[PDB]
Amino acid sequence: QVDELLKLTEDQKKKKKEIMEQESLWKNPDFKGYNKTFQELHQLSKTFANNQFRLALSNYQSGVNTIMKNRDWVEQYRKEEAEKKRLDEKWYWQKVDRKAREERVVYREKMKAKQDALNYFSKAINHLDEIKNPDLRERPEFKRLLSDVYRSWIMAEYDLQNLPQTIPILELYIEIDDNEKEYPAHKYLASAYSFEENMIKKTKGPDDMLFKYRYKKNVHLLRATELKYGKDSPEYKHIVNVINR
Amino acid sequence: MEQESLWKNPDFKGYNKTFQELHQLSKTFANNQFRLALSNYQSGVNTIMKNRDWVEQYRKEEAEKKRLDEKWYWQKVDRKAREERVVYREKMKAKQDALNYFSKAINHLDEIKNPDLRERPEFKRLLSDVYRSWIMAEYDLQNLPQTIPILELYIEIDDNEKEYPAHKYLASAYSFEENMIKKTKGPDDMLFKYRYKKNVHLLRATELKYGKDSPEYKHIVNVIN
Amino acid sequence: KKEIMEQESLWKNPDFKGYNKTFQELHQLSKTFANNQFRLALSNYQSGVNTIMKNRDWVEQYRKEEAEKKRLDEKWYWQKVDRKAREERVVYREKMKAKQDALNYFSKAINHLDEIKNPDLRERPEFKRLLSDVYRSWIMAEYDLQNLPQTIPILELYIEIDDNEKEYPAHKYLASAYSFEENMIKKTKGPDDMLFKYRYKKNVHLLRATELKYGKDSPEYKHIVNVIN
Amino acid sequence: QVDELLKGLTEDQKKKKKEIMEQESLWKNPDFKGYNKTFQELHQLSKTFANNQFRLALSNYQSGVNTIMKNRDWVEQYRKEEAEKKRLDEKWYWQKVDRKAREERVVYREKMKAKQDALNYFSKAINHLDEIKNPDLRERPEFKRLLSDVYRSWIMAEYDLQNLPQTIPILELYIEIDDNEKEYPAHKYLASAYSFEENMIKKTKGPDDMLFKYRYKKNVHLLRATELKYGKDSPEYKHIVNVINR
């Protein structure tokens, strides 16, 4: 129920704006977001003036471009196939079979794009790992790019339901700056643990595994709730009751 | 082409022509059991025609909806799978109701006992139309084994055995059964029976539309050999 | 050349690029296999790889933190030497704990694959792929901490799978491990039957590895035959 | 426990804290950064004394300290270079461990060579000071300052590389000069060196008379060191007395 469970004063108005800005950033790339992100990242690169950061930004951009181009390819492919006349398609089962072939073509292409995008994201990380000076690693420019690469990586895996793969990345992401205080990161961590708990329940797996994943799901479901609604709110009191009863 | 047109999926133009013709034949026949069989057949075709429209409308409504809470590829996939199960369930229910009307149409034609009346062109025309619509309803939902007894009854009527599509569908239905035996590791006697019957009808369909000693007939003989 | 390099690339400590590709592929195979026990084996294998990777990050971070600390009361060369030795014991203990946890997950993966009793299912490419990945990861975890003898039974199980015997790295590691055992017998003044057994098995795999990547009747194969003779 | 223990009023206590810090500052390895004050003090001594043997002793001492100072930079640079290298054929934990051990042997061999050369210069500095026979000149503050500095650098060179037994005779010569016996670090290092000798006896299963002798001499200096920087009847002096007692 992780997915379903998520939906003034000067401080509350400031909080609503921040949560919306965070939520906007945790989605598949679109043009408005792409334009804003790379305009910002390129001026941070100018202020940083670091060759390894330059190379990490180039790889990150290439990765986002891979994803964006593929998303257009899918919309175009779907359109082309819908517009074709099928004179030798008389039966219900034939259209079902055809649609299934088309969806496998799409899935194969989305898969390929994600793989290539993650290779660019992982290369971006490799370049940031080359920045050894601790003073440079503490820079806001460094932490911003690092967070953007991991978030894009999480979302790419999430899009194709590779929820287990997201867990180590989300864990690396929440270690950066004050990322642990971002409700979206806890929401996606709770979702991935929930997926594993459901897999154990379905495969009739060992109870020790079931309870482990249920607990970790609840840890992050509770933290996410606390972060966006606040402790002692009707939503936090409710999540405590679902865990208890 | 005339035979292929007859075996085309039901549409409005075909429906209008079929029932205008069948009602004119009912007048000439002037038989109460034929009138009742025609009423049941029409109701069966109406179930199919209504469902055909329901699906197109359902698929349109679902495509036109705003999905603000569908961010991910896997979500759309899950949603589309749910929608296709709704379509399949409704098509299965409509087929069952249509076949229940075709079965009733057959029951009324079975009540015509006079052999002179059973030999009438009106009788044979309605009977062929009921069986053809039944075969096509089952074929639409890939119920190919179910089409075999119905196709066998159909080719017995008048000169229906000289119809290339009737043999084409019989060959497909037997091929499906041969493949089912191969998959389920069924008895070899059944495998070979289905393979032979597939080939009998594949060869007859080829002979019917291309002619014996044509490049297409000579080829089918070589694939079997 | 491309295929040999792709094979050699799998035979290393887990990284991002490899991880990403491996688990995308393995989850795809799990869908086509549609088997409960395979899904549970995969979950345990993934958790095992995750243990390894997490520990390798922990070590890099720990080393960094300790290097960045101000030691106002460390005036002498011998004090830094003593301190670095304490830090390396902390690293070794943590690497050993991570290996133990990772091997537990790999052992649990194997237990789930042992539950697949149908011989038709055990012959599936999906089954053999996961099994090879579990064993290969296990070998590399032990190899990383110089537990070469421990790699021998696993490498032997690994080369039995499909065409894994035609893999040059499997033979390279088996030869290395048997050489270590031969040297251990020579050092501990162990029984001669064991010395000769390990020497022979080292040579079998040294020769096979050479034959596999350079080919029979190449200058490198001819040379290895001459060193043995 | 010598190492763990000694790990360091608005009128008298403030005066005491300043003196201990000045003494502790004096007892560090020589490094380039900041050496300017120290170096300037040394050449002004040569100018005031105007003695050829002192001039030669100072030259040798300075050469000795420079050997050590140059080496300390060499080590920092070597370590940096090796850390910055790409090792494409280093896949395993045990390989990095082996590599680091090779690097530390290179460092140790270089530090040992530098210590040997520095001690040769210190030995030569002592030889030149031994040539100053006039007792009036040997009593000069310039003479005693250089002598103390030569011995201190010698002690610290040996101490750096854990040659603690070798520091004992030199420390004993050093505490004989002027008021050097009132120096807390001199006692701290004598205590540490005697502790090392006591531990060596315990390890090598040496004679009990030697174990007890080194334990006693360790305690004599541990107690004096404590008394000197914290004062007698302070919580730290009272504690050291209790560790010796029970």
From TrEMBL, chain C:
Domain of life: Bacteria
Keywords from the named record: Signal
Protein name: Uncharacterized protein
Organism: Leptospira biflexa serovar Patoc (strain Patoc 1 / ATCC 23582 / Paris)
Full protein segment contained here: 63 to 291 of 300
